[PDB]
Structure formats: structure tokens, C-alpha cells
């Protein structure tokens, strides 16, 4: 019964190990770096057609097909170049807050306030998009069942857990436990061997997909972490929270490097994404604006223009050419 | 594969989206909230790991889609953002259990002061009034044990034209209604209105009480959109 203070003794060994390596700051090393400049971006396409609030988008790996979910109970697959509607999938649940596109391109996933991740088959011989699996077994809602490895999915929320379903069998292979609050966002690494995960207990946790262990945890924020996104080399990640701040952690130093905050901003971050190079940190906010942050200088390089409601989803395409922003005004917009 | 035949597909999809906009704008969404002691499942059954239950019912050619939530965690500050742009919230309280009636007040206060539910009206269904009368006619358990300000409460002038009952049933049930409207006024603006009702176990008028109160919420959505306020 001596465990409650030996745990706090361990958590001071971690803070003494993290402060022994903080010899400098990311603001000090990048003081002699030339700034990026004012980034004017223009709305190139505006994809209309959703009847209700858009909650999630995801690009394809071809950098041309978007999928988008909305609260009417429909997924729409868009052609980004020609503003075309490829598919219109009517869902069984109206309440869906995650969507996915498989990196092969054959599958889309969706999940929501029903506790199921629904995998859909796009390359069906019969010509219609049929549901392939209804992955049930996750007590509580599904926030980011939205990342496929290749034919195994990773799911995140509700029971404060993350899972590693096998789509062929329809059962859980690894349950990731260790978050106290509801788990809001996950980001897979480029190598698909690690994934970082953010919850409403103000902590982000690295997990190993093969072993099933939480090998690191990051406790820097002050409120619920709503969005998470890996750096393009998988050594860093970014978290946006309800405290109007974005923070850049590092996996090899195991601490927080830079905080992206402004005194004008008082609204929480709903969506974070990086550029292809890692210099830009695009963040969507509770008000109707997206900000472009320099990830090396903590400076607002620019601002994406207006939606009429809350910017809810944001994703930079795999070629790095476009930035797609979807909001609660039923409109997706493709930026450049 | 000619690109002109892909625009004919994209125009045929939009014709299906516009004839699904007609059944989306015409239907009225609702949200049931309440604890387990509140007779919430009885209201669903008297109308005509699954994380959401849906119930459709028509009252005079108007479709209502209730969304009884279940199989969720205790904290609800994250999925309540999903139920912005709903027509109402049907909050059901058990009136009998006065020990758990105070946590129904702090639960109602968290809804009414929510950042994402600032424009949404609440239709309170004060439930099990057949069980509250027996707990004040028998007089064993009494409300002023838990609230210090019941003895300084008297029934107002215009109150409850009942067919016949006790005046302490009317005095108590107007006190339970009084704290709920007190949160509806002091911690809120004139953007959304609470609508208190009194409901028994078997009651075939709950579908009419929702229709009459949702005829009123749409009337104040129109009086502000047409700027007639």
C-alpha cells in the first residue's frame, strides 16, 4: 500500500530527466532562420452538396479524392480537380464524427455516436457501395476510427481506449488502455508502426502498434486535446487543445518544444495539420478562421479566409499542393 | 471514360441530395436526456453497445426524430456538441426521489449554460406525478428536509386548475417547477425558453405536448429570422 507516493516519486524522476536535457529552446536555435513570409492562400474550389454540419474529411493517397462526412447521414466522395461527386453513401446513423480513406483506395470507414466503425467497399463488382464490416465492440462513441494501416484499422474513443481491429475477421487484436478521459484524436506515423493519441485528460500518449504498450506520455496542456498530427518524419507531433494553444512535442527528447499561442486567440483548436515539409502548422479554430503557423518560429504566417461556422476538419494533401477545410456551414473549401 | 458522363453522374447524385433535403428540413429532431430513475424509457414506449437509440413518431403529419442516447461514458461535454442545431431537448426528471432531485438541478444547469446549446429550448417532463402525490399525501418524506426554502414558499394566485386533488400536491409540485424555471431565467438570456410540463407514467398526451411546444420553438425561430422581434 505504498504505491500512491512511489508513483509521484517516479514522476519526479521523469521531470528531472526531462529538465536535464532542456539545454536550449527551439526559439533559440531558430533565431537566425529567415521567416516564411506572408502566406496568402486563395479558395480554389468550394464543394457544395452536404445538407448539414461537416465533421470530418480525409484525403486519398492520390491527392485527388476527398471523403467527407456530415450529420445528415451521408458520406460524399469528391473529385478535387473537377468538383464532381463520385459517390454518395447513405449511412445507417446520422451522427458520424470520423471518416477515413484507405491508402489503397478501396475502402472508406466511418464512425460516430453509434459505437460502430462501418467499413464500405468502393470497388464492388455490383456497382453499389456496400458495407463490408460493422466493427462493434467499443463501448462509447467513435471519435477517430479514421485511420487504416492497410487492412487493419485503429479506432479511438468512448471507453477511453484505442483498438486495433482486423477487418477480415471483425475482432480486436490489441486494446490500448491508459487514458483517463475520452480520446479525441489519433495520428498514425509515416512508418505505420507507432501512433500518437490525444484525450480529454490533457495528455497525449505514444503507443506501439505491435507490442500494445504506451511507451511515452506527454502532459503539457491545460485542457482537452482535440486534434493531433505527426510531423512528416515521425519524430515530432502537434496537439491543439481548448486552451487556444498548439504545442509541438518531440519523441526523442520526450518533452514540449514550442507553444503556438496568441493573446487575441481565445477559442479552441478543432483541427491541426502540417505541410509536406513540416514548416507550416495549419490549425482550425472554434471561430470561423484557420491560422497558418510557422512551426519553427511560433509566428502566424497567415490566415485562411472565412467560413461561416466552426472549422471542424482540415487536411493537407499528400502532394502538399492543396489544403482542404471543412466546416459547420456545409461547405468544403480547397485552398492553395 | 468521357468526363461528360461523370458530370451526368454528379448531377444525378445532386438530384438525390435535393430530394433528401426535403425530408431533412421537414423533420424535427429531438434529444432525450435524463438519469435512470427518470422514467425515460417509459416515454419512448408510450409513443407511436448501441451508442444511440432513435425513435420516429408523427403527430398531425409532422415527423419527429427522437435520439435517446445510451451506452456512453459519464462525461458528456464532448458529444453534446453534436446536438447543436436540434429543435429541442426533452429533459426528464424523476420528481419523487428528492435525494436525486438536486443532482437533476446541477445536470439541468450544465445543459442550460452550455456554450454549444445556447440557442436550444428545453421541454422539461417532470415525471412520476402519480408517485409524488403519494409521497406528500402520506407525508412521511417531506421536501423541506433537503431544501431550506420550502417553508417560505406559498402557492401563487393562478395555479393548476386540477379536477380534484390536495392543495399540498399543488404546493409541492409548483416548488419543484420553481427551481427549474429559476435556472431558466437567471443563467440564460431570452434566446431559448424552458417549457415545463407534468407527466404521469401512462400518459397519452406527451406526443401532443411536444407538438404544441415545438410549434412554439419554430415560431420564435421565425420571429428572429424575419426580424419581427
Amino acid at each position: 500500500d505504498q504505491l500512491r507516493q512511489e508513483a509521484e516519486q517516479l514522476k519526479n524522476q521523469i521531470r528531472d530527466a526531462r529538465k536535464a536535457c532542456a539545454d536550449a529552446t527551439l526559439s533559440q536555435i531558430t533565431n537566425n532562420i529567415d521567416p516564411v513570409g506572408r502566406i496568402q492562400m486563395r479558395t480554389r474550389r468550394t464543394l457544395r452538396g452536404h445538407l448539414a454540419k461537416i465533421y470530418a474529411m480525409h484525403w486519398g493517397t492520390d491527392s485527388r479524392l476527398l471523403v467527407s462526412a456530415s450529420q445528415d447521414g451521408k458520406l460524399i466522395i469528391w473529385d478535387s480537380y473537377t468538383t464532381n461527386k463520385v459517390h454518395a453513401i447513405p449511412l445507417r446513423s446520422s451522427w458520424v464524427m470520423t471518416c477515413a480513406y484507405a491508402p489503397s483506395g478501396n475502402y472508406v470507414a466511418c464512425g460516430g455516436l453509434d459505437n460502430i466503425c462501418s467499413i464500405y467497399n468502393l470497388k464492388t463488382r455490383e456497382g453499389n457501395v456496400r458495407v463490408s464490416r460493422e466493427l462493434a465492440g467499443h463501448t462509447g462513441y467513435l471519435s477517430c476510427c479514421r485511420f487504416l494501416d492497410d487492412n487493419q484499422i485503429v479506432t479511438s474513443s468512448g471507453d477511453t481506449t484505442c483498438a486495433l481491429w482486423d477487418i477480415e475477421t471483425g475482432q480486436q487484436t490489441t486494446t490500448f488502455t491508459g487514458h483517463t478521459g475520452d480520446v479525441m484524436s489519433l495520428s498514425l506515423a509515416p512508418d505505420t508502426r507507432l501512433f500518437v493519441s490525444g484525450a480529454c485528460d490533457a495528455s497525449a500518449k505514444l503507443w506501439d502498434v505491435r507490442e500494445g504498450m504506451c511507451r511515452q506520455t506527454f502532459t503539457g496542456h491545460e485542457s482537452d486535446i482535440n486534434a493531433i498530427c505527426f510531423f512528416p518524419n515521425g519524430n515530432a507531433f502537434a496537439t491543439g487543445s481548448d486552451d487556444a494553444t498548439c504545442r509541438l512535442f518531440d519523441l526523442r527528447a520526450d518533452q514540449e518544444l514550442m507553444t503556438y499561442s496568441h493573446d487575441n486567440i481565445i477559442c479552441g483548436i478543432t483541427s491541426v495539420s502540417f505541410s509536406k515539409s513540416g514548416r507550416l502548422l495549419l490549425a482550425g479554430y472554434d471561430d470561423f478562421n484557420c491560422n497558418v503557423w510557422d512551426a519553427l518560429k511560433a509566428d502566424r504566417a497567415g490566415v485562411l479566409a472565412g467560413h461561416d461556422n466552426r472549422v471542424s476538419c482540415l487536411g493537407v494533401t499528400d502532394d502538399g499542393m492543396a489544403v482542404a477545410t471543412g466546416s459547420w456551414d456545409s461547405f468544403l473549401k480547397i485552398w492553395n | 471514360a468521357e468526363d461528360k458522363a461523370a458530370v451526368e453522374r454528379s448531377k444525378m447524385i445532386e438530384k438525390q441530395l435535393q430530394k433528401d433535403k426535403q425530408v431533412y428540413r421537414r423533420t424535427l429532431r429531438l434529444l432525450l436526456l435524463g438519469a435512470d430513475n427518470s422514467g425515460k424509457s417509459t416515454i419512448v414506449k408510450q409513443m407511436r453497445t448501441s451508442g444511440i437509440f432513435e425513435t420516429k413518431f408523427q403527430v398531425d403529419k409532422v415527423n419527429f426524430h427522437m435520439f435517446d442516447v445510451g451506452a456512453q461514458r459519464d462525461e458528456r461535454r464532448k458529444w453534446i456538441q453534436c446536438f447543436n442545431d436540434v429543435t429541442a431537448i426533452i429533459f426528464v426528471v424523476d420528481s419523487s426521489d428528492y435525494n436525486r432531485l438536486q443532482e437533476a438541478l446541477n445536470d439541468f444547469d450544465s445543459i442550460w449554460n452550455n456554450r454549444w446549446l445556447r440557442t436550444i429550448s428545453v421541454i422539461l417532463f417532470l415525471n412520476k406525478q402519480d408517485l409524488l402525490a403519494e409521497k406528500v399525501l402520506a407525508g412521511k418524506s417531506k421536501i423541506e428536509d433537503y431544501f431550506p426554502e420550502f417553508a417560505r414558499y406559498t402557492t401563487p394566485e393562478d395555479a393548476t386548475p386540477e379536477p380534484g386533488e390536495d392543495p399540498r400536491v399543488t404546493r409541492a409540485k409548483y416548488f419543484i417547477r420553481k427551481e427549474f424555471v429559476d435556472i431558466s431565467t437567471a443563467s440564460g438570456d431570452g434566446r431559448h425558453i424552458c417549457y415545463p410540463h407534468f407527466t404521469c407514467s401512462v400518459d397519452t398526451e406527451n406526443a401532443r405536448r411536444i407538438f404544441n411546444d415545438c410549434k412554439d420553438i419554430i415560431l420564435q425561430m421565425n420571429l428572429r429570422e424575419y426580424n419581427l422581434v
Partner: single-chain antibody, 230 residues
Framework: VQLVESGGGLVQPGGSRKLSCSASGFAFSSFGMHWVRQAPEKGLEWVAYISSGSGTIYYADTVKGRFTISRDDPKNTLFLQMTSLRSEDTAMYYC??????????????WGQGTTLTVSDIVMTQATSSVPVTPGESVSISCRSSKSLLHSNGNTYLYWFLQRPGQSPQLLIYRMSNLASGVPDRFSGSGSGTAFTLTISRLEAEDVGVYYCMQHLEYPLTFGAGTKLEL
């Protein structure tokens, strides 16, 4: 997936005959439908077309004004009403489906065919008969009048194969893309006017008549057909 064609038979010229095509096992209303005729010991020829929703109906010039194509999506059937039959209408009329979105595979499934016997970009195959023993590399070339490279980057060229006593099946649909159910022996390259279908190792089911088809301009003109015999 199945497309059974009905109607057909012997018609004295000057009369009329309606054809039918009962679809089963796919979503018929989301597929465009074509008709492709095949005269005895000749090549293929495109006849008519009706799109999904019956909004676009396009005909060839040899059947325009005389042939009428319709569909009935609740009964999942496809019609071709021919009015004054000439003796150039003695053919086998196939009922090929096609879907049109980004990444689709049109002309993917064909029907059995009906034998009716009545009593533009020109695509030419460079050869007509190549006898090759099983196990060698075969190249089947074709050329076009106009370049098939549109401004969007695509090269609208569709390779086929008709085995003896069968319906044609699609092999390569946009000059480079293999179909579903086709092995990696079949490979296709091209440059805009010159096109080449290469078979790496040859089997016994690889014999038949190989066709090529453009999809830029809508009177879809085929090739003459290259026959591999063994």
C-alpha cells in the same frame, strides 16, 4: 453479374423487331448501357447508348432515325427497337454495361448475345494474324487517326479479347490499366497515336481476336481485330 439478351431471329427486311436485355446481379440504374453489333466473320461495331437516368442517348450514323434504345429501370431491362431492318443489320448484338466516374472501368461486362439474321476517328490494326506458340512474348499494335491523349492526361483506349464462342472481355481500359480478373501478363503502353498491347507469357486462354476501341468521340470506332492462332 449477368446480362441475358432476348429477342432476335429471322426477319424479312422491311419489318421490325424489339430486342431485350434482362440484367441481374448489379445496380442497373447506375450503369450506362451500350449496344455493340458483330457481323458474321467481321469486326465489332457500336450501335447505341443510353446513360444512367436516360439523359443522354447517342447513336451511330448507320442506325440513327431507324433504331430506338430505351430502358426500364424498375424491371431492370434494356430495349432496342429497330424499325426498318436492312441486311447490314445481320449481326450478333451484345449488351455491354459501362460506368463513368474517376477511376471507373467502363465496358467491363458484356452479355451473351442474340443472333438477328435479316434475309470519325478510324482505328486500324497494324496486322491481322500472328501465330505464336505458347510461352513467347506477343505485341499487338494499333494506330489512330486523331491523337487519343486528351488535355486532362488520359489516353482513352480500350483493349479487348473475344475468345472463340464467347463474349468479349475487357483487358486494358485507359492504355495502361489492367481490369479486374486479368493477370499481369497483359501490359499496355502507348504514346498518343501508336499503341501496343504486350503479352509476356502466353497460355491457351490467351487466344482469340484482340480489339481496340477509342473513347474520345462518341461514335465509338473499334479496330479490325488481331487474331492469335496456335
Amino acid at each position: 453479374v449477368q446480362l441475358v439478351e432476348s429477342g432476335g431471329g429471322l426477319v424479312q427486311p422491311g419489318g421490325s423487331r424489339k430486342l431485350s436485355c434482362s440484367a441481374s446481379g448489379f445496380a442497373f440504374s447506375s450503369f450506362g448501357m451500350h449496344w455493340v453489333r458483330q457481323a458474321p466473320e467481321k469486326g465489332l461495331e457500336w450501335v447505341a447508348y443510353i446513360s444512367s437516368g436516360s439523359g443522354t442517348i447517342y447513336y451511330a450514323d448507320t442506325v440513327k432515325g431507324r433504331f430506338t434504345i430505351s430502358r426500364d429501370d424498375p424491371k431492370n431491362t434494356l430495349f432496342l427497337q429497330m424499325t426498318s431492318l436492312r441486311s447490314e443489320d445481320t449481326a450478333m448484338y451484345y449488351c455491354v454495361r459501362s460506368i463513368y466516374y474517376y477511376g471507373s472501368s467502363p465496358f467491363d461486362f458484356w452479355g451473351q448475345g442474340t443472333t438477328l439474321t435479316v434475309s470519325d476517328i478510324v482505328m486500324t490494326q497494324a496486322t491481322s494474324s500472328v501465330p505464336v506458340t505458347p510461352g513467347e512474348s506477343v505485341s499487338i499494335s494499333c494506330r489512330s487517326s486523331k491523337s487519343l491523349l486528351h488535355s486532362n492526361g488520359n489516353t482513352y483506349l480500350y483493349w479487348f479479347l473475344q475468345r472463340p464462342g464467347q463474349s468479349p472481355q475487357l483487358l486494358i481500359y485507359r492504355m495502361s490499366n489492367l481490369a479486374s480478373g486479368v493477370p499481369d501478363r497483359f501490359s499496355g503502353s502507348g504514346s498518343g497515336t501508336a499503341f501496343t498491347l504486350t503479352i509476356s507469357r502466353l497460355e491457351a486462354e490467351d487466344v482469340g481476336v484482340y480489339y481496340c476501341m477509342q473513347h474520345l468521340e462518341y461514335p465509338l470506332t473499334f479496330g479490325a481485330g488481331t487474331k492469335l492462332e496456335l
